[PDB]
Amino acid sequence: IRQPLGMGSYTEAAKAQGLSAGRILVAWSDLTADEVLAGVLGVDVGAPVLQLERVLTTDGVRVGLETTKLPAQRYPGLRETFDHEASLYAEIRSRGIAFTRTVDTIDTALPDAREAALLGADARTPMFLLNRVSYDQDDVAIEQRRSLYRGDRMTFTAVMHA
Amino acid sequence: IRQPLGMGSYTEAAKAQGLSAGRILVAWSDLTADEVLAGVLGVDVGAPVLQLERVLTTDGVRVGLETTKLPAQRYPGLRETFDHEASLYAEIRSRGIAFTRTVDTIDTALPDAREAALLGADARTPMFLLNRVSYDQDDVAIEQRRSLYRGDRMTFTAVMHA
Numbered sequence: 001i002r003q004p005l006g007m008g009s010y011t012e013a014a015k016a017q018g019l020s021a022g023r024i025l026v027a028w029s030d031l032t033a034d035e036v037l038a039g040v041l042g043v044d045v046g047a048p049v050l051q052l053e054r055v056l057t058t059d060g061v062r063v064g065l066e067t068t069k070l071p072a073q074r075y076p077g078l079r080e081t082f083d084h085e086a087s088l089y090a091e092i093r094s095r096g097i098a099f100t101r102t103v104d105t106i107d108t109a110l111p112d113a114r115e116a117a118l119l120g121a122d123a124r125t126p127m128f129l130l131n132r133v134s135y136d137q138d139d140v141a142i143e144q145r146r147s148l149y150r151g152d153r154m155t156f157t158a159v160m161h162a
Numbered sequence: 163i164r165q166p167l168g169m170g171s172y173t174e175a176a177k178a179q180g181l182s183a184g185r186i187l188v189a190w191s192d193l194t195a196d197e198v199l200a201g202v203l204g205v206d207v208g209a210p211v212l213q214l215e216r217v218l219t220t221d222g223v224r225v226g227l228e229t230t231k232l233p234a235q236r237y238p239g240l241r242e243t244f245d246h247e248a249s250l251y252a253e254i255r256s257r258g259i260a261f262t263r264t265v266d267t268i269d270t271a272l273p274d275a276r277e278a279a280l281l282g283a284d285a286r287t288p289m290f291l292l293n294r295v296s297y298d299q300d301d302v303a304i305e306q307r308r309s310l311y312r313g314d315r316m317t318f319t320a321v322m323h324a
Contacts, residue, residue: 002267005167007322104320105164108270108288108313126270126288126313151270151288158266160169 001058002155007102009089010147014058023066025084026053026118031069040133041071041141048072050079052088055118056147062119064149065111071141097142101135108151115148126151163220164317169264169296171251172309176220185228187246188215188280193231202295203233203303210234212241214250217280218309224281226290226311227273233303259304263297270313277310288313 001019003010014021031037031049038045050072056064068088070078075095082091089099107129116123128149134142163181165172176183191213193199200207212234218226230250232240237257244253251261271291278285290311296304 005268005320005322007324098324100324102322104322106167106268106290106318106320108290110286110288124272124286126272128270156268158167158264158268160167160264160266162169162260162262 001063001153002157004157004159005104007099009087010064011056011058012087012089019059021056021058023085024055024057026055026065028052028079028084030072033071037069037144040144041069043071043073050075052082052084054084058153061153062150063153064147065115065118066148067146069144069146074140074142092142098137099134099142100137100139103133103135105131106156107131109148111148119148119150121150121152128154128156163225163315164319166319166321167266169261171249172226173218173220174249174251181221183218183220185247186217186219188217188227190214190241190246192234195233199231199306202306203231205233205235212237214246216246218311220315223315224312225315226309227277227280228310229308231306236304254304260299261296261304262299263301265295265297267293268318269293271310273310281310281312283312283314290316290318 003013006013011021011023029051031051033041033043033045033047033049035045038047050070053067055062056066108126109129111121111123111127113123130147132145136142165175173183173185193211193213195203195205195207195209195211197207199211200209212232215229217224218228269291271289273283273285273289275285290313292309294307298304
């Protein structure tokens, strides 16, 4: 699977290029933001954080493990009502939030044993590790998202013009 | 090192940002183009191809292994005169050839023993495997470039706007 780097969800993007794709819940977790995460999200140190962790499939195989950290206060009732199998991105937009800017870091790493088990991967195999912070129309952070993608099932691409 | 994705050379980008950067020669090689590479460069099967392989350094340490395949006919005198410690991109521009469009694929990979030895890396370490074709102002191919970067030394970044 060859995926242009993009602002939109890659699950939705895979759906677009005419492929099957989906999301499998791993866990919701209630966290409180440490100094680092508080700074990233622009919330108080100790603020509630809602974490959604999912396995991502495409073309009926596992391709990624996505861990999204949300400032809980921005999202009343999300954990109670969100269909974790739907598009998180669309739900947030539905809440009057526009994905205005995204800052992505692209790393490469070996999965830990838990990540490797969730993805059906050999732990020796390198994975893409993407980390994203997205910002809304007022430049308030929406989410911090970590995506671990199987190196053998994903190629990212970029076309650039002078 | 955090490096924005971009069309410019990453070695030069590091120097533009105030870091030391440089290149070490591994080898120049005379190849002829087979069917796949003839296709990529827009040249005839058997056309001469000049390969430049260099180790790239930044902030004093080895960060990547670059293997650049050039249609030799486009660059008279390059092997014997080009200073391999200097910017190949700038030499190509000084010859009147503008980097106008790039097509990059971004993969993750483990190095082979030779690649690992040249990079001073453990062969269990994840690497970025980048492959690029660049095209000039007349959409004529300039090079095909394979870059293998140490995952523990490089992080790529992208910022995107709605």
